[PDB]
Amino acid sequence: YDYHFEVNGTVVRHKNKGFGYMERFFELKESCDERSKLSKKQYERFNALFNFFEKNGVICMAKDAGTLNTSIEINSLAYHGKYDVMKKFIEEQSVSIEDDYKKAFFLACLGRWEESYDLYSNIILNSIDESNGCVYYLSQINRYRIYQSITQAVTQFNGLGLLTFGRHYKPFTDEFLARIEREMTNFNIDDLFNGMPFEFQKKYKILEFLSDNQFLYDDTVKLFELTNKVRSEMSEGSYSFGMSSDIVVLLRLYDNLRFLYENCLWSVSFHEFHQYIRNSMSLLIEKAEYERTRDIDELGFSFFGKKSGFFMEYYDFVNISRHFKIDDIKNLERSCSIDKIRFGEQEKIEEYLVGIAEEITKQFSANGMNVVFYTQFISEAKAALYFAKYVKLSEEGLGKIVKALLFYFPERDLDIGKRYVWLERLTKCNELPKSIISIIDDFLVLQAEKHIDQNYSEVSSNGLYSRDYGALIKHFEKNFISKRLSEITLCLTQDKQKQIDFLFKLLPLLSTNAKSHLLSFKSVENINDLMNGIRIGLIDEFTPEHEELIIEYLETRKVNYIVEKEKGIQTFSSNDYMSTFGIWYFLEEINNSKMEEFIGMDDQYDFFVDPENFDYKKFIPSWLKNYNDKLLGKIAGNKHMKHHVIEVLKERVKNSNDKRYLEILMNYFI
Amino acid sequence: YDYHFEVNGTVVRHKNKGFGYMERFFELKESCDERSKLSKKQYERFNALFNFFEKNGVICMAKDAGTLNTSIEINSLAYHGKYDVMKKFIEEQSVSIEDDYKKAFFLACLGRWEESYDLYSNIILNSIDESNGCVYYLSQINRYRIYQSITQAVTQFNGLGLLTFGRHYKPFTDEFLARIEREMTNFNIDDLFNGMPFEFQKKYKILEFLSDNQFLYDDTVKLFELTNKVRSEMSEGSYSFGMSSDIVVLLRLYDNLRFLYENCLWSVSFHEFHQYIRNSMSLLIEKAEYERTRDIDELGFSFFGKKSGFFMEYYDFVNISRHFKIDDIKNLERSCSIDKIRFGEQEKIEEYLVGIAEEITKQFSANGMNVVFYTQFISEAKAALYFAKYVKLSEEGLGKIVKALLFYFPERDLDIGKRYVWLERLTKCNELPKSIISIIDDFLVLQAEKHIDQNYSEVSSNGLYSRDYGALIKHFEKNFISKRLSEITLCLTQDKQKQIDFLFKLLPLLSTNAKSHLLSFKSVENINDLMNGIRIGLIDEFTPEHEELIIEYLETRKVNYIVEKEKGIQTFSSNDYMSTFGIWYFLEEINNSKMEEFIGMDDQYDFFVDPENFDYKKFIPSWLKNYNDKLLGKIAGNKHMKHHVIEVLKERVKNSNDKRYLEILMNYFI
Amino acid sequence: MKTVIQDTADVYFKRKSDGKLVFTAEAQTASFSQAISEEKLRGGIGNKPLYILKSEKEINLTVKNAFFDLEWLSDIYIQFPNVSPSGEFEMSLENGNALAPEIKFEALADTDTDEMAVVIEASRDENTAAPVEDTTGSTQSSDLGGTT
């Protein structure tokens, strides 16, 4: 504790009551003549201390120093995800025990947790001879960490791994699980550093934090202690320049990462290190949308500079892609504004996203992956493609990422309506050329080829289906024909039933000759087809047999209502069936007078169809979340609906925390 | 770690291998017949264990999971503010070494930090002949903490606010500040648990955390469950069930306060522990405000019929009163609306507030203050009287609080601008009864008697003076004339300066002789002696003789406007009262037809004398801040400006960040 | 009002086959941390215009203290097609003079990812998150108790 060394390399002293050695030391670095007073034996030791303080970034002199361009650079094949280069490193013939130490950490990142327990045990069994026991100690930690990963993956695989996989998946032999339980019994990870020799414990007191199971608490309390500074930054809070706040939170992350990955520590793959990266990067982004829309004035400019936007680079993309789940990014996209954060180093992100594409193509287009590697990898591959809305990709790069999103991603991690979401997100700054359209067109034909079976249904978690792929192509190319979905359309007969219903929902993609062969094979006969034939442009006004089927449907929905409420079975719709009918009656698209006879089963029906007799206390103000530009125009225009909503909407602005109500209250109702 | 002891009072099997010894014990609680078949020595041991787990709130196992709604009790005189019983426990000459341990805690709470250090030093010398050694460990901790409390106070009584505040020098002499330091060098706090025997390191291992400077890092990290509850509010539809992460935060706060006070630990005075209570309580008010305004729910009604809600009680009041500043309560009052949380237990909260009055009274009516105790009591006393907007009071108790606030409170921190705020806030739940008039009416006589000296003035940090007190008497008692303030008025000399205009700042409280005789001194001179009449005099009458001087003032300004127009720079005057004159024409006090013919003045004058033909392109948007509620109420009648002030708020509500503009439109203009 | 004190429940993971709906076994789980979360944004379809904006509903769930999860009472090699079934849910409530609202979820996938913890055993109490799937039919239903 004789010198504070900070995250930039600045050197301020405490408890050094004596001679200022590290205050003086850099003066030998400055003058070549003062260091010429050294002996020709101790000059070789200044030929070594110069290297160590340069590459560890304590080349910054002291407090009597200016600014520093504190870069970061991580030379580790495991951080960048270089999976093929890591495989070619293991197969090489070992020379050093510090090469066996680095093979052991690559075979764990690649999923081989049995081969990695074994090479950690071999190092420990022959690296006690060496005069420095950092390889003994750091392997003795990593092996217990590789024990814990095996021990609670077999707890997962026997439990929640059963009902998420459809198989059993035991990847460790029962002889292997029993050997590692009897070796690692009565091993105490908290007591290993006291088990070390005396000379080790004085020369390596900075490695004692790696065997305490709670080691970033000295960084997590600082992350909190710098969170409430942001929470107390409401009445024009200062220190938003971040030279004493943002750079502190960021350079303490980059030093922890460069410690754990350069020194090959397996503690990096656990939830406690994964959460430190989540808390630190969400704090930098929370101080980037908040503390961006602040009181912009000339008085805040003279207080402090550095009021530019936040900058993400290559290393910040990898850290969000690896350490976040999808929900943790989904918090930030509804909290902060990531379209407001510029991304730099676009061409290095398109070599991390493409290697993620080729670790999914070249590992699922074969007969399969490793399951232990699947558990580690697939969260990273999901979040990297999800957060690639924000980077721009080359045409040859977008083509390879899309063919792994649509074809080789496993269906259990990405169903048909989550593949659609991540395909629509890759267009928002990378609008689809013709070379990517012919990949969606080649995925619509593989979904056609699976409805040849009669009992098959596209399961979706959000109810976006294979239609939306069709409507996405037509949004970018208004005149398009799938010349191969036509060739299956013009070969249809009535025996295939599910074929006809699938290809009808993709009708504008078909050619004008090929439509009529399927137009002649499908008549509108249910309220699903009444609404499926609306969303493809087939129907533009209701020929009044169309108006009959809605009347026909509610007659069923009327008569069950009595014999369900005596039973109490209160139904819940799968989709906006009844609410859309009232929009059809409020916009006068249905003129039937029998429509009023069904007033009273659904409150969203009862708003539109009986716009006075509603008493408005059953209004749910999330109903204005999903109305168009058009409908809200007529909501203002209705002489009854114009003002009760205004009392409802004002208390949804006075009390809530969503900006969309603020947009609705001015743009449509003023 | 064989059992996992949850905070609700339950037990979960954690790492028990063999016979579950906590399963049998709770059976021995429930089955009284099984309790009989024991021996006659392990039966008296069972009464010891039953009285332990019932005072420590360990109810049962989790397998049956009885419905529990347990509450908190903190058996400590120091928590509740019983300063008088603590003093007559210090004077009571002790009998036991675990009773001197309680006094040196109670001395420390009283700011007698010299006699705390010494009495803890006797306990360290005198705990040799004691078996357990608990009072040895917890006295080394407490003396080190009381050493750290002194070494800060030497930097505040000689540091920032050292100037003239009374006992401006140190309270700790030179012989003591040297005697403590020579004893406290090389007391390694980290080497205190390790030095104790291995019997103390296993029979009392749970006190390991108190020997760390970084203590409560392990509870600041777990308070990162705050992210788990920002996550449920941000996901905005998350319906946590059972023991949600809110109730974990509250039951873990309570389990930390009850430990540190009932074990008489001095770390409960530090800033690390105060910030833990701030950050945990602020989160719970936030989840209360979010829940009371959640957007209903279309489908969650199967469980969401209602919620009981976070409500306040007495221990939740003492924690906000002791551990927050006024700056922290105002952050909660900006984000939440605490007038919607119900405050329970309002016969105990009155006894805590009557005590804070009786400690302010018995310390600044006598000349025996303790300058260490005043440093740490005054934040609690300020915060408790500030947070009593929300608790209904009895007219005896509301008297003893208001009397202690106006007369007996120290002037150095709570000036009359803040004494006004904190008596205005007590009128919310309690309509101002008859007696509190008399407590103010004594005070305005005393505030008159301090204005006889010519060099005195009322300094206000807000700007609010004793003028605003007098409205609040008339705001409640519409027919009340202070008799003695009339008796002050009948004895005046016209040679007074400060006494004259002071009674003009309370002229609407005087009698018809006292108003008239003070009106005899009231002599208007010019326009500069007229516009302060609405500021000071308040005649509330606009005679045509006064209106003739208004026309004469704009006429002489029009003669100067000829020079300003010929010079090319027609700048407004420094005493721009023309902008005020349109408002009085708008509120129909001036009914002259020459007010509209006085064009060429400031644009606010033309805005109200002619709202039709005003250049709204030449409108300045910042004018709306300075407009009172009578105007902002009355503009809505002026439809010839209603459609355009809505056009300049909307040109700023999306555009600026000043939320007053939103509050102008959302309270009025809609 | 009526004594509504009901907070926690007990949720029944039922059983379906790879192409069938067997319901015979069960894999039910205890209390639910229950971040039940309806982020519904489902949309009306307009007659003349069209839009491809974000308009869809979803239901996420999670649970806690799972049990009865072994055999329902080695080719280590994962493949991209999956034909895994979807266990139907029941949620049984209490605390009323009426019977439980008995909320049923019809088709449900299982979305949890594994995670390795430094301390031990990856949690004091595990969690299985569970989304709700739909193809051409209902996604939830409330069987209000009424009598008993």
Numbering used by the authors:
A (entry chain B), B (entry chain A): 336 to 1005
C (entry chain C): 1 to 73, 189 to 263
Manuscript excerpt for this entry:
The determined cryo-EM structure of the DSR2-TTP complex contains DSR2A/open, DSR2B/closed, and SIR2 domains of DSR2C (DSR2C-SIR2) and DSR2D (DSR2D-SIR2), and one TTP monomer bound only to DSR2B/closed, instead of DSR2A/open. In the complex structure, owing to the remarkable flexibility of domain 2, only TTP domain 1 with residues 1 to 73 and 189 to 263 was determined. Domain 1 encompasses strands β1 to β7, which make extensive interactions with DSR2closed with a buried area of ~2900 Å2. Notably, loop 1 inserts into the CTD and loop 3 extends across the CTD to penetrate even to the MID, indicating that these two loops may play key roles in TTP binding and activation on DSR2 NADase activity. The binding pocket on CTD of DSR2B/closed widens to accommodate TTP with only a small switch of its helix α42. However, the bound TTP makes contact with the adjacent DSR2A/open, forming a hydrogen bond and a salt bridge with the α30-α31 loop of DSR2A CTD. Notably, this interaction drags the loop of DSR2A/open toward TTP with a distance of 8 Å. This dragged position is almost the one of DSR2B/closed, implying a transition state of DSR2A conformational change triggered by TTP from an open state to a closed state. The combination of TTP acts like a key, allosterically causing the MID and SIR2 domain of both protomers to undergo profound conformational changes with complicated translocation of its secondary structure elements, though the conformational changes that happened on DSR2B and DSR2A are quite different. Thus, combining with in vitro NADase hydrolysis analyses, this conformational change with a large distortion of the SIR2 domain tetramer induced by TTP is suggested to play an important role on triggering the NADase activity of DSR2.
As a sirtuin (SIR2) family protein, defense-associated sirtuin2 (DSR2) has been demonstrated to participate in bacterial anti-phage resistance via depleting nicotinamide adenine dinucleotide (NAD+) of infected cells, which can be activated by tail tube protein (TTP) and inhibited by DSR anti-defense 1 (DSAD1) of diverse phages. To defend phage invasion, Bacillus subtilis utilizes DSR2 proteins to sense and recognize phage SPR tail tube protein (TTP), then unleashes NADase activity of its SIR2 domain to deplete the cell of NAD+ and abort phage propagation during infection. Each DSR2 protomer contains three domains, an N-terminal SIR2 domain (SIR2, residues 1 to 297), a middle connector domain (MID, residues 297 to 627), and a C-terminal sensor domain (CTD, residues 627 to 1005). Structural analyses and biochemical studies reveal that DSR2 forms a tetramer with a SIR2 central core and two distinct conformations.
